A paper describes a structure:
A potential target for antibiotic drug discovery is β-ketoacyl-(acyl-carrier-protein) synthase II (FabF), which is one of the essential elongation condensing enzymes of fatty-acid biosynthesis, a highly conserved metabolic pathway among key microbial pathogens. During fatty-acid elongation the acyl-carrier protein (ACP) substrate transfers a fatty acid to the S atom of the catalytic cysteine of FabF. FabF requires a catalytic triad, which in the P. aeruginosa enzyme (PaFabF) comprises Cys164, His304 and His341. An unusual feature is a completely buried potassium-binding site that was identified in all three structures.
An efficient recombinant PaFabF production system has been established that produces in excess of 10 mg of pure enzyme per litre of bacterial culture. The apoenzyme crystallized in space group P21 with two molecules in the asymmetric unit and the structure was determined to 1.73 Å resolution. Analysis of the crystal structure using PISA suggested that the dimer present in the asymmetric unit is stable in solution. The accessible surface area of a subunit is estimated to be 15 460 Å2 and the area occluded by dimer formation is about 2840 Å2. The dimer interface is therefore formed using approximately 20% of the total subunit surface and the solvation free-energy gain is estimated to be −221 kJ mol−1, suggesting a stable entity. Accordingly, the monomer exhibits a globular five-layered structure, α–β–α–β–α. There is one active site in each subunit. This is a narrow cleft in which the three catalytic residues are placed. However, access to the depths of the active site of the PaFabF apoenzyme is restricted by the conformations of Phe230 and Phe400. In all three structures the satisfactory refinement of potassium ions with full occupancy was noted and resulted in the same octahedral environment for the ion. The octahedral coordination involves O atoms from five different residues.
Numbering used by the authors:
A (entry chain A): 2 to 413
B (entry chain B): 4 to 413
The structure:
């Protein structure tokens, strides 16, 4: 029946760094990765900043010939994946390649490539669309290209669930392993939606912070002066592995993935209900899946995107699920520093949750200068808090009311 | 926990619902024609499978519909159809146990085109406020859950040609695991626009048989020259067996197996031996606890491509051995074209209906079977025959493979 799933490898590109340790160093130091966007002219836009990946060198991962065929979200996804596989120490062979799969997702995918090709179509005609437009832009090609590069022949797929993509990708990949469909999965997500369509689109929806004068203070979850999310880019990948498989090869085990929960709000296209009813049902599903007492939860890495309705819904949901224990645990939003990585958010935040377990420290919610009415939990304001963490949750409560919760536990 | 199919819904190039589409399938009718909605003079391919006469206001108000990309409208239509067909009554007692997994290969290309037009010509402040929510792939699942009040697992797959097949398979897993009693699963696509036809055209992936569009899709025929791009949607209501029995549901068939693999070979062209497709079919059969000899009908991937079609023949021969000549295999894409994200969903429906009616759909246009294509490919005309177990295959871009196994329920 249901086999146990552990984390043996991790990889990442974020607004804070070009790998896991550098990103984590920034997280624990309370550093913002948010800055005015330099790669395009945003003078005509209401938001002119975000979390860019800085100094990415694709030549550390892929030949120039292969890299030019790929949208940045694919480059980022492959980078995080290559890091995670290397980190795991796993040797891929004919004996195991059929048992190793991939589930790397994205919220929007190759929007830069789509936009660029639409410009070519409109101004020059259809014969100027790139032959690599489809294979270089569709969301499943992170899973596609990774499997080809490394010879991974197990289950191969891709989620697209907006803010929840990375969380679903990791959860369902653990389900594959638990079910016996695979012994190893590379899972997570990637995003690069910082183009005219992305910044303009979220801008037209009035979804983004417009705090152009102080970009590092823009992302401020649970603060009374929050005004929308900050768009960020990057990727996270984890190597998930069946427990006995990991033990048999003497793998280093970071943590155990013990629970995964899902729900739908069935409420609104963009905003959650203020009581966070769906989020609460999601966390409850996750806790039951993990066979845990709620009081066992020590740290919650929040969705916390710095939106009026979104942030307050999470407080309400945490209070409903945990009761008086809501005041004993610590919850923080690392999006205060990284901004919102959309399809990659759940992946980088799973990594942060695993590292919170490794290092026994809760990452801060920076910018929490004045908590809003009712936001009176331990939200780890301003600075990292060393504390006991035996169980960590990571929440993603995304566009369309799609909810996912992952439950991680210390392994010994 | 066993999983059964209690409702189905569809938009295809052959009809605006399941029965109309199925009638076309059994008649050998083509849904492919020159594309009318845009000027394709400068394009190498000027035809495909369009949904004709779709009326969204049978499902949604004009205001609701306006914001949503066509792929979402199509996905909602199939989903609404399937839920209605199932007879399920949604209540407070069960709403947290009913979820949605509707996917798409490429999603809102038409809305992206339109908002690009506005961005380039007049700037970012002229992008639609509803662009993002009305264009992102998970919004079929999102909108459906909101409209019907469904609070169970809510997600979306995007695995090109295999989307619909993965969506149905993984929704069945949700039910089997106990995280849901009912799932609405499938896919939708509306990519037969400028970016889609131009994009696949640039990749030289499409048939260019502009002079005879109905003859263009010709799986395993020696003169095939690429796939035909088509629009539409399919949706299935998957239900736990006891749940279905307790409410007296009509059960079309049972979903008994789901298999996956990766080729880890090429972007678009599978290995000639179909090794990945073979592993996938074997995985599906193992999941179902069935021997290859129990399979009666296979609804192929069969997109009408040189490498793709022949890999499937090789895969079927390796998996089924001598029994490969006893079963029937056909590609309904010969009539429907390739619905991309919706292909696996509409083809799961065709497989279920093959079981209901005991008839194998034809592979039309199979005038001259290519070298080695000597199986029973149901050439030209529908074939009544015994069908106890049916497979549906999807072997998609990226080498991503999925196989569903359906069985008669008595
Ligand atoms: K989180
Ligand atoms: K099929």
């Amino acid at each position: 029946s249901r086999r146990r799933v552990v984390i043996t490898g991790m990889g990442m590109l974020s607004p804070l760094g070009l790998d896991v340790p550098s990103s984590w160093e920034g997280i624990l130091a309370g550093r913002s990765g948010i800055a005015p966007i330099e790669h395009m002219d945003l003078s005509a836009y209401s938001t002119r900043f975000g979390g860019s990946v800085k100094g990415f060198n694709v030549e550390e991962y892929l030949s120039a010939k292969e890299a030019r065929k790929l949208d940045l979200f694919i480059q980022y996804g492959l980078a995080a994946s290559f890091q995670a596989v290397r980190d795991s120490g796993l040797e891929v062979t004919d004996a195991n390649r059929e048992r190793i799969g991939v589930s790397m997702g994205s919220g929007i995918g190759g929007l830069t490539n789509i936009e660029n090709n639409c410009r070519s179509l409109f101004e020059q005609g259809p014969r100027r669309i790139s032959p690599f437009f489809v294979p270089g832009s569709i969301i499943n090609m992170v899973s596609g290209f990774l499997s080809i590069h490394l010879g991974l022949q197990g289950p191969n797929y891709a989620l697209t669930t907006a803010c929840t993509t990375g969380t679903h990708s990791i959860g369902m990949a653990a389900r594959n392993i638990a079910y016996g469909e695979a012994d190893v999965m590379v899972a997570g997500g990637s995003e690069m939606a910082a183009c005219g369509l992305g910044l303009g689109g979220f801008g037209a929806a009035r979804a983004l912070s417009t705090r152009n004068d102080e970009p590092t203070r823009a992302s401020r979850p649970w603060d009374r002066d929050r005004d929308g999310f900050v768009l960020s880019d990057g990727s996270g990948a984890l190597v998930l592995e069946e427990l006995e498989h990991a033990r048999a090869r003497g793998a280093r085990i970071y943590a155990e993935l013990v629970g995964f929960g899902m729900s739908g709000d069935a409420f609104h296209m963009t905003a959650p209900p203020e009581d966070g009813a769906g989020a609460a049902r999601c966390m409850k599903n996750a806790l039951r899946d993990a066979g845990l007492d709620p009081r066992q939860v020590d740290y919650i890495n929040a969705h916390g995107t710095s939106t009026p309705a979104g942030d307050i819904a999470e407080i309400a949901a945490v209070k409903s699920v945990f009761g008086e224990h809501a005041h004993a645990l610590s919850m923080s939003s690392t999006k205060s520093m990284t901004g919102h990585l959309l399809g990659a958010a759940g992946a980088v935040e799973a990594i942060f949750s695993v590292l919170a377990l490794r290092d026994q420290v809760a990452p801060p919610t920076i910018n929490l200068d004045n908590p809003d009415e009712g936001c009176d939990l331990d939200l780890v304001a301003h600075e990292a808090k060393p504390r006991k963490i035996d169980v960590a949750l990571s929440n993603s409560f995304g566009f369309g009311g799609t909810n996912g919760t992952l439950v991680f536990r210390r392994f010994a």
